[PDB]
Structure 1
Amino acid sequence: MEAAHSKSTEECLAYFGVSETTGLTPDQVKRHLEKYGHNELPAEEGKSLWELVIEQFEDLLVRILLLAACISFVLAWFEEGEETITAFVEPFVILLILIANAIVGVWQERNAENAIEALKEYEPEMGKVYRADRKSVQRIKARDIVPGDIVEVAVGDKVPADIRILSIKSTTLRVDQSILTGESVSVIKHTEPVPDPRAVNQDKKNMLFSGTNIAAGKALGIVATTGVSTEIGKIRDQMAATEQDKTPLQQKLDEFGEQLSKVISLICVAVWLINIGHFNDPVHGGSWIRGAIYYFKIAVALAVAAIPEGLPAVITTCLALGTRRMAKKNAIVRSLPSVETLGCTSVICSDKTGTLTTNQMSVCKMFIIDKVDGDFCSLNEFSITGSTYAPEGEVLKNDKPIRSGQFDGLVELATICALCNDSSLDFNETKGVYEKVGEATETALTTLVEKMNVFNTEVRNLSKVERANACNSVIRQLMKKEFTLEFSRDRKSMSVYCSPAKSSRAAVGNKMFVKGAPEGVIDRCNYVRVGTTRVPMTGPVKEKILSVIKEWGTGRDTLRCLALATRDTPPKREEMVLDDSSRFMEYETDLTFVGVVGMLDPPRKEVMGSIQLCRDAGIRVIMITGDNKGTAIAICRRIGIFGENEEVADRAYTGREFDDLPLAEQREACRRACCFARVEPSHKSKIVEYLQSYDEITAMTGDGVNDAPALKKAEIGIAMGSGTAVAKTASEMVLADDNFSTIVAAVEEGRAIYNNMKQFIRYLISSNVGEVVCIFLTAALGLPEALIPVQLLWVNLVTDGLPATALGFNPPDLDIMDRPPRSPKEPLISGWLFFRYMAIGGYVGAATVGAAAWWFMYAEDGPGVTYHQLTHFMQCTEDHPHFEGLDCEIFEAPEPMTMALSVLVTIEMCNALNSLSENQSLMRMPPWVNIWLLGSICLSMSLHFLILYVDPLPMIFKLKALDLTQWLMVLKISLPVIGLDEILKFIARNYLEG
């Protein structure tokens, strides 16, 4: 709907024939999506440099190869000699092999396309709509929004599509049109039509332009235009299909692409040039042309075999599958180019509340009096699991689960926590999560009672709503709370006067349950409860209790402790002043100590583990909280940022302290800081700036508008899933978890994706290096050639096909988080890595030629045993008194070629096992760690077994079936490529790093 601003609300509603109290019907949605498409810009042609210089180049190669095969195929007819067979089927076999290559290529492309499609499911549903299907609001993808459906927006939301405002539910509606008109000052909107059809967007105060931010309010509207039809879509249409900004890794790959193109081209021309003396050999008929054509067919076949194909598809596959695993672990990465950056993350700046900690007060420790003897006491210390307000957790004694009912003291402890409490627990059915009802420190007691369950109430078959206050209600049905003595700051405690429920004894059984600061309460305790009995409070006992309370509040955990006491014989209610808080302390005297609870704001799941993972990975972790310096440090010590006993005077700063520092000192601070407490929202940008001045790949967390500038500036902007949509737009990743652990998991996955690429590159390059070496080794020395054109195409199909692709499905490396963050400035291939290529390649090339010369030079149970000159083999028909019962055509035997081919194929299948990890041993990273690789090896070996033993096949490939003894010779020379790499792995693992 164009010029919707000109028309009224009624006119706009009538345009699509939709009620704003109903929404679009499925028939409407289907048709509208068909006619209008989706709310997005068209994807630009992804024609990378690698495609033209490598892929399109190789395509030309197989065409001129087939042509060169077609040419000699015609020349073969004019050959009056014996009508050959193998050379007659050469163009057929070549095309047949090329067909297989296309099949493997399609499978690779289909893998990538499927893996990309799978990412559309985890697309963040940032858009609320009303449809005819549900009478409530619905969360739908932004691109799935069609012009016509009723959209609801609120505060902190980014406008999905161009929307004509129908009704404003709030008092006012403010929108941020800085991304378009050019002003951060939020504009006010209305529902009246803008009569001028040719008015600027600044005067269109009844429209919600897509991309803009809703500053304040809540309004309802109808979508006018989506996709490129968008006002900002026409602005974004500029850099739509025309741009120039490749990622650092893409630049390295394209650069690496040109390097391969030049090298492969030269070494193949070299092959054709060093064999010009063999153009007139009698095996070529003596024709210079027929000789040059043959070696042309070898060079090009060598090129095809040497060229590492499938790289774009493999990389895209790893990237998409890896991203899915991130989203599977609540890590929603919007843009794929952010992943390589995410894997280079060197510093993580995280918020504490909700991210590092659960922001839900939880009692994790408690102790009661065990035994008292000779004016001394022992304690029963318990630990409680669970870190949320949910009644989910266990009570432990010595790391072993126990029942609270087994301890009479624990029964009274729960009684006090459930009665001396004004708060409660509620289950939000909408959000599907338990929420507190009152003070956090009180709800921690409520949740504790439910976890304890001292009366063993059946709760397993209860609903979430009923479970919330189950055990607490059980206690309240036994004791009736008469009144409550409010908290007083002069005594730092509170108490409740209670009585037995359903009791006719009005003046019998009354108790007072006291809670508050340990020192104050314990000082007013003349007795100590042991089980159900009590004993007089003694010195050593009081000193013992306070010592443990001291340890809990001074130790690494720094627990906020509370004393729980009971007045066994409380004063009469008719003798209590209830309008004077100064009289309450007197009423809370002559108490009996029961126990002590210890609570905190616990770290989220796997956070303490993830923090240690960062230190192992050389990733700095910086906390940004809103607490005081003293507590913030204590929290850092608690979660593992700081040690239990480490100096923190230079690694912890407040907003006040940081602003007192000059620029050079501020920049110096962020270099070593690990904690920032009570900081302005502008400080996050300054922190990022100073971190970037040290070449640190910085990750910053945010949830609101105030964080959006810092989120954009940081390399990895990290927004909260529970946060505003404006922050999500300014971020590179969204936390569905809101958990810090998710960030670390996302970083590890990024490092994993990159490593799979390297092992993919290492296998192909090293193996194909040997393929090139093999051709040159038999040429430089002068040995009889080991490979023919169709055999080269066979190695290309077998070794560069499925086994290569399956390496992308490699599991995360073991030492993946034991290595420092990868520098984006580092080369794609290091010097030592290049050496590893030449090392493995140098062997597989020699082991191939050596296996062929093995049939000639140190022949075992086979014909042709000559340790002498094989160099001048072309002179065998010149000087014959050098053989002994063996023709000169035994040099043309299919036996050494079969050995050379079998070894080359097998030794690369071995090299594939070497590519299961970069530096880790096969002893630590077993071959069965990748099932897809093994299946590819079995398939590749099956094809090789197929060619050698199915009678019509080894004729067209010039091969002969190898004996069981001859095959054991193949493994004998192929397997030691594992050990060679195993040594290289050991060296780099025990010297180059550690």
Structure 2
Amino acid sequence: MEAAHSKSTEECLAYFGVSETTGLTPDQVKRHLEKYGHNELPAEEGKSLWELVIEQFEDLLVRILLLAACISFVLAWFEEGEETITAFVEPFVILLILIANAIVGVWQERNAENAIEALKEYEPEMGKVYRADRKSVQRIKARDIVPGDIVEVAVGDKVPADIRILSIKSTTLRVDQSILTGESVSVIKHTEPVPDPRAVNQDKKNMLFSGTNIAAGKALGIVATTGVSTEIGKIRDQMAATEQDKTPLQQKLDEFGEQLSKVISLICVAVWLINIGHFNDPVHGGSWIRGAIYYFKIAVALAVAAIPEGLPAVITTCLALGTRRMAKKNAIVRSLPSVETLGCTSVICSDKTGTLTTNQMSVCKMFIIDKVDGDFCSLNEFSITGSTYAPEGEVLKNDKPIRSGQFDGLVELATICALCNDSSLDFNETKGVYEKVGEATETALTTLVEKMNVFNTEVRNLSKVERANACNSVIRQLMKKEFTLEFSRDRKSMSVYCSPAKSSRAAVGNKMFVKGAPEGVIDRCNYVRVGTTRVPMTGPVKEKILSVIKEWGTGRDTLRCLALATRDTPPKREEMVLDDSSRFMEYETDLTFVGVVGMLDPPRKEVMGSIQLCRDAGIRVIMITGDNKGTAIAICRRIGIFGENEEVADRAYTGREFDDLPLAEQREACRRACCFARVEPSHKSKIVEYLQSYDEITAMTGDGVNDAPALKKAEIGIAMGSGTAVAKTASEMVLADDNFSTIVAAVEEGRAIYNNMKQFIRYLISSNVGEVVCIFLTAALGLPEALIPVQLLWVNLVTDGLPATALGFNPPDLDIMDRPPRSPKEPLISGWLFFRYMAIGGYVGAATVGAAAWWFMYAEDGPGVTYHQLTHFMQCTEDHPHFEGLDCEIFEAPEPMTMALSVLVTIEMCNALNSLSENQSLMRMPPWVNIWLLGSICLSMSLHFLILYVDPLPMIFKLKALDLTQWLMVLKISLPVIGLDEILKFIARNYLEG
């Protein structure tokens, strides 16, 4: 339907040939499905991972290496024909590191994006429509909606397809169009057409765009367009303009990227300078610049060596791993910061109904007045059986299945439950189960009236689908619902205006049927009803009504309670202004109390355990609900927020009690209280905010539209997969699983990512530092060159590659979830950690010179026993009579350097074994823990041996194999790096843990 906003309701209805309250006939759906196709869009797949490769070479750190490899090719064509074989190998050692990391990155990324899409596709989105098939609105797959059928949407819902509003059942309809038109505040909608057929979306005050959300109210509409013709689907791929930012921790690390890029950049030019006197030597050529271009390459190489090229990748990787490990538990991570941030969470604020609880509602208990006389009041309690929304069960007065329509009080009771209710019940033929439509609290009421069957209607001969709303319909046919004063959380009630059907149908005039939070409703009653009788509300009656509410609520079943009243003589229809939902409370006055219903909503299985684990991880769990304080505290005990016999005077507050404290007090209350009840949507947001003023990382969990502000306000918000679209829109993560536990797992995972970044940094820094202090300790002790350009690039590629990246795969620490949360203040590199760096870096630096020197000094059996005084070697062509028959060439020998390059690689692979934990022992956390690391250690350890024993290589890399006893040395000097950190780990484990 083109430009449906231009034509009236009748024009659109007729245009498709549909009856407004009936909807398309099965043959109209078959036919329309063909002419219009299904209501969906072309999915997104992944053939060429090319765009996922470009991103691997975009970070600052990799570009510097990208430049390095580039420059090392400028010297390739400016190299003399003698060692060209080693001039071209350089660029490929700077690229081979980059490329290997690129693979693990893009690969890891493709995995995440896949588990994600497999979780998003898992659950088909539903829609609510009227089809001629069934008298009551039925639930269908969203992708089955065709232009033409009547669709129903209410608060919380997500618009399934471009819809022309036919009717607005509430006094207002608001919509979150942000995703489309871009406007922030919810916009009002109407049913009148907008003449301008060119008008912009923002002027279509009668349409509802697919993918937007109902912020408030309920409305019936006819579908105009679906699938690709939606003003949402026409701008899909033609959009993709949601520029993915960068997680706080990422920027933190990439910041730390230049913070090292500056330092490293300096130590390099701090080498090209401390060797300006060597630019002219017999060794490095001789020319006035031929020696300068050399040490320029010792710099550029030490740079490439020092720079952590794996940092960007490993972070990117650990993140994709997070999304993946979460998707594995049916948690959709809508924002990469989530897991990370959840790591730092110190308080988990959580909605009760449908979040902590299951939102499986069923009225098990109900009561009306029985007899009133003086200070004596009696109620007729009843019990109802069946726990699902199935119309199967009985009403028992005293263990005896009772005929509800026998008690006049119950007739009304049911009348109200049916009339004052924006929800229905639908039967799923596929699943063979009765499903709710709308809010559980309300459908619960729907099933109750079906069980009550007060007008002894013949239902025994009705299909499972018809039996669903039979008795409800019967009651509707007896009263015309004029308009509805929709539900509002400030009044905590909802009413409905009705008049008799025909000329008859109990023609006592007009009525309003009210239902809501027992307190509010009971106070607005001046009369209790006794059967068809009516008597003035008195202290004793009120006292009694309330006490039984209190019992059921704080009792073992911890029932959710609701009061039912009717206004016997409403105002005149005209005397009522239906624009201000604030005026609604007064139209709900001079009420007559009819009865109360208590519903059960069992708490989720994993909530108790999950909370206990949060307690251990140093994480609080506040309950935020609109429900009665009593039923709240009761539940809080059941799920383990409060002890079973704990005094909770200062730790439980109603919205009112809370607003009664001065601000500074309200703030403090958030720090000790763990239960807020009968609190509004502004309250939850305020609570969370308070917690944040103490600079805490706060999370919020919910499912209701009342949780949206909080969810948005909180650092990380988590929506139930069963909840509302609006709640989900406001969240950083959805529990499709509905499993409360996953929240904790996410928290563990977020601490994991962090510790993995730490060890990755601790490794790369302690290591690359020993490399620099190996060279500066060389020039300072006067000893000959320790290494050469390619010899650096090699140690680089072999120590700062897969062995480092693998750290990102380190498992969670032994006490990760037993320490309190990481203070957001805590600095990246601890003061004690920087000693640890230099204390380890200093060893490997002086353990690599002590090895090349061992080839000269105490050169046991090694050809060239120079012994004492090695500091001087430049004075051999001038003072040979100082060395006994020693050829001045043993100083240019490749053997001392090979001893060094091997101790380097080896001591580093040993050091990586230290990076499986921060402060845990290599025995407490065995090296075999991270298998991925070992496989990498060995891939490198081996990759190095190919250089030492495969003819063409040791030539290019200017090295010479070692005796099986010289390796015993390489080890004898490397393996003790483990004992050093082990001591440093013992120090920080018995004096400085945090």
TM-score with structure 2 setting the length: 0.67
SS at match of 1:813: coil
SS at match of 1:466: coil
Q: Deviations over 1:680-739 (max 9, x none)?
A: 333212212221221122222222222222222222222222222111112222223434
Q: In the alignment, is residue 692 of structure 1 matched against residue 692 of structure 2?
A: yes
Could you say what the CA RMSD is over the residues aligned between the two structures, in angstroms?
Answer: 13.6
Q: Deviations over 1:522-541 (max 9, x none)?
A: 99999999999999999999
Distance 2:830 2:631 in 1: 46
Q: Deviations over 1:777-823 (max 9, x none)?
A: 21122111221111111122112221222222222222111222223
Instruction: Pick which of 199-208 and 185-194 moved more.
Output: 185-194
- Any conservation in 2 of the 1:685–1:709 contact (CA below 8 Å)? yes
- Any conservation in 2 of the 1:426–1:436 contact (CA below 8 Å)? yes
Provide closer, same or farther for how the CA distance between residues 59 and 33 of structure 1 changes in structure 2, counting only shifts above 3 A.
Answer: farther
Distance 2:57 2:439 in 1: 70
SS at match of 2:880: coil
Give how far 1:188 is off.
Answer: 7.5
Provide closer, same or farther for how the CA distance between residues 491 and 837 of structure 1 changes in structure 2, counting only shifts above 3 A.
Answer: closer
Partner residue, 2:959: 959
Instruction: Pick which of 195-204 and 748-757 moved more.
Output: 195-204
Provide closer, same or farther for how the CA distance between residues 297 and 489 of structure 1 changes in structure 2, counting only shifts above 3 A.
Answer: closer
Give how far 1:273 is off.
Answer: 0.7
- Any conservation in 2 of the 1:8–1:192 contact (CA below 8 Å)? yes
Give how far 1:762 is off.
Answer: 2.1
Partner residue, 2:924: 924
Provide closer, same or farther for how the CA distance between residues 823 and 82 of structure 1 changes in structure 2, counting only shifts above 3 A.
Answer: closer
SS at match of 1:457: coil
SS at match of 2:892: coil
- Any conservation in 1 of the 2:98–2:309 contact (CA below 8 Å)? no
Give how far 1:334 is off.
Answer: 1.2
Distance 1:170 1:314 in 2: 53
Distance 1:873 1:699 in 2: 66
Partner residue, 2:426: 426
SS at match of 2:369: strand
How many residue pairs match? The answer is 994
Q: Deviations over 1:76-129 (max 9, x none)?
A: 999999889767976787778887787777767767777877776579958789
Distance 2:185 2:574 in 1: 64
Instruction: Pick which of 638-647 and 226-235 moved more.
Output: 226-235
Instruction: Pick which of 896-905 and 385-394 moved more.
Output: 385-394
Give how far 1:954 is off.
Answer: 0.8
Distance 1:794 1:567 in 2: 87
Give how far 1:505 is off.
Answer: 48
Give how far 1:300 is off.
Answer: 0.6
Distance 1:587 1:263 in 2: 73
Distance 1:53 1:327 in 2: 23
- Any conservation in 1 of the 2:68–2:300 contact (CA below 8 Å)? no
- Any conservation in 1 of the 2:102–2:313 contact (CA below 8 Å)? no
Distance 1:106 1:462 in 2: 58
Provide closer, same or farther for how the CA distance between residues 212 and 889 of structure 1 changes in structure 2, counting only shifts above 3 A.
Answer: same
Distance 1:537 1:488 in 2: 25
- Any conservation in 2 of the 1:351–1:624 contact (CA below 8 Å)? yes
Distance 1:736 1:386 in 2: 27
Provide closer, same or farther for how the CA distance between residues 876 and 256 of structure 1 changes in structure 2, counting only shifts above 3 A.
Answer: same
Instruction: Pick which of 244-253 and 888-897 moved more.
Output: 244-253
Distance 1:11 1:536 in 2: 52
Distance 1:572 1:151 in 2: 32
Give how far 1:752 is off.
Answer: 1.8
Q: Deviations over 1:836-871 (max 9, x none)?
A: 222222222222222212212222231233442222
- Any conservation in 2 of the 1:54–1:257 contact (CA below 8 Å)? no
Distance 1:146 1:26 in 2: 12
Provide closer, same or farther for how the CA distance between residues 55 and 476 of structure 1 changes in structure 2, counting only shifts above 3 A.
Answer: closer
Provide closer, same or farther for how the CA distance between residues 121 and 436 of structure 1 changes in structure 2, counting only shifts above 3 A.
Answer: closer
- Any conservation in 2 of the 1:651–1:675 contact (CA below 8 Å)? yes
Distance 1:40 1:585 in 2: 43
Give how far 1:509 is off.
Answer: 54
SS at match of 2:290: helix
Instruction: Pick which of 465-474 and 697-706 moved more.
Output: 465-474
SS at match of 1:529: strand
Provide closer, same or farther for how the CA distance between residues 632 and 305 of structure 1 changes in structure 2, counting only shifts above 3 A.
Answer: same
Give how far 1:938 is off.
Answer: 1.7
Q: Deviations over 1:916-951 (max 9, x none)?
A: 222222222222222222211221122112111112
Residues 623-638 of structure 1 aligned to structure 2 (within 5 Å): 623-625=623-625, 632-633=632-633, 635-638=635-638
Provide closer, same or farther for how the CA distance between residues 523 and 732 of structure 1 changes in structure 2, counting only shifts above 3 A.
Answer: closer
Provide closer, same or farther for how the CA distance between residues 970 and 529 of structure 1 changes in structure 2, counting only shifts above 3 A.
Answer: farther
SS at match of 1:282: coil
Q: Deviations over 1:535-588 (max 9, x none)?
A: 999999999999999999999999999999999999999999999999999999
- Any conservation in 2 of the 1:116–1:317 contact (CA below 8 Å)? no
Provide closer, same or farther for how the CA distance between residues 55 and 871 of structure 1 changes in structure 2, counting only shifts above 3 A.
Answer: farther
Provide closer, same or farther for how the CA distance between residues 8 and 596 of structure 1 changes in structure 2, counting only shifts above 3 A.
Answer: closer
Q: In the alignment, is residue 937 of structure 1 matched against residue 937 of structure 2?
A: yes
Q: Deviations over 1:182-238 (max 9, x none)?
A: 999987767886431243545423321356432567778788899999879999999
Give how far 1:36 is off.
Answer: 15
Partner residue, 1:774: 774
Instruction: Pick which of 576-585 and 611-620 moved more.
Output: 576-585
Distance 2:436 2:63 in 1: 72
- Any conservation in 1 of the 2:157–2:725 contact (CA below 8 Å)? yes
Residues 376-387 of structure 1 aligned to structure 2 (within 5 Å): none
SS at match of 1:47: coil
Q: Deviations over 1:497-526 (max 9, x none)?
A: 999999999999999999999999999999
Distance 2:916 2:585 in 1: 71
Q: Deviations over 1:368-388 (max 9, x none)?
A: 999999999999999999999
Partner residue, 1:895: 895
Provide closer, same or farther for how the CA distance between residues 359 and 891 of structure 1 changes in structure 2, counting only shifts above 3 A.
Answer: same
SS at match of 1:95: helix
Provide closer, same or farther for how the CA distance between residues 875 and 453 of structure 1 changes in structure 2, counting only shifts above 3 A.
Answer: farther
- Any conservation in 2 of the 1:112–1:313 contact (CA below 8 Å)? no
Give how far 1:270 is off.
Answer: 0.9
Q: Deviations over 1:660-698 (max 9, x none)?
A: 322121111111112223433332122122212211222
Distance 1:165 1:270 in 2: 73
Provide closer, same or farther for how the CA distance between residues 910 and 158 of structure 1 changes in structure 2, counting only shifts above 3 A.
Answer: same
SS at match of 1:582: coil
Instruction: Pick which of 240-249 and 792-801 moved more.
Output: 240-249
Distance 1:502 1:157 in 2: 35
Provide closer, same or farther for how the CA distance between residues 773 and 750 of structure 1 changes in structure 2, counting only shifts above 3 A.
Answer: same
Provide closer, same or farther for how the CA distance between residues 355 and 936 of structure 1 changes in structure 2, counting only shifts above 3 A.
Answer: same
Q: Deviations over 1:648-671 (max 9, x none)?
A: 332233334323322121111111
Instruction: Pick which of 88-97 and 760-769 moved more.
Output: 88-97
Provide closer, same or farther for how the CA distance between residues 247 and 416 of structure 1 changes in structure 2, counting only shifts above 3 A.
Answer: closer
Give how far 1:991 is off.
Answer: 2.3
Residues 674-685 of structure 1 aligned to structure 2 (within 5 Å): 674-685=674-685
Q: Deviations over 1:57-84 (max 9, x none)?
A: 9999999999999999999999999889
Instruction: Pick which of 954-963 and 840-849 moved more.
Output: 840-849
Instruction: Pick which of 300-309 and 439-448 moved more.
Output: 439-448
Identity of aligned residues (%): 100
Provide closer, same or farther for how the CA distance between residues 619 and 483 of structure 1 changes in structure 2, counting only shifts above 3 A.
Answer: closer
Provide closer, same or farther for how the CA distance between residues 805 and 442 of structure 1 changes in structure 2, counting only shifts above 3 A.
Answer: closer
- Any conservation in 1 of the 2:525–2:537 contact (CA below 8 Å)? yes
TM-score with structure 1 setting the length: 0.67
Give how far 1:434 is off.
Answer: 10
SS at match of 1:774: helix
Distance 1:935 1:22 in 2: 66
Provide closer, same or farther for how the CA distance between residues 535 and 901 of structure 1 changes in structure 2, counting only shifts above 3 A.
Answer: farther
Q: In the alignment, is residue 622 of structure 1 matched against residue 622 of structure 2?
A: yes
- Any conservation in 2 of the 1:108–1:310 contact (CA below 8 Å)? no
- Any conservation in 2 of the 1:356–1:739 contact (CA below 8 Å)? no
- Any conservation in 2 of the 1:566–1:593 contact (CA below 8 Å)? yes
Give how far 1:888 is off.
Answer: 2.0
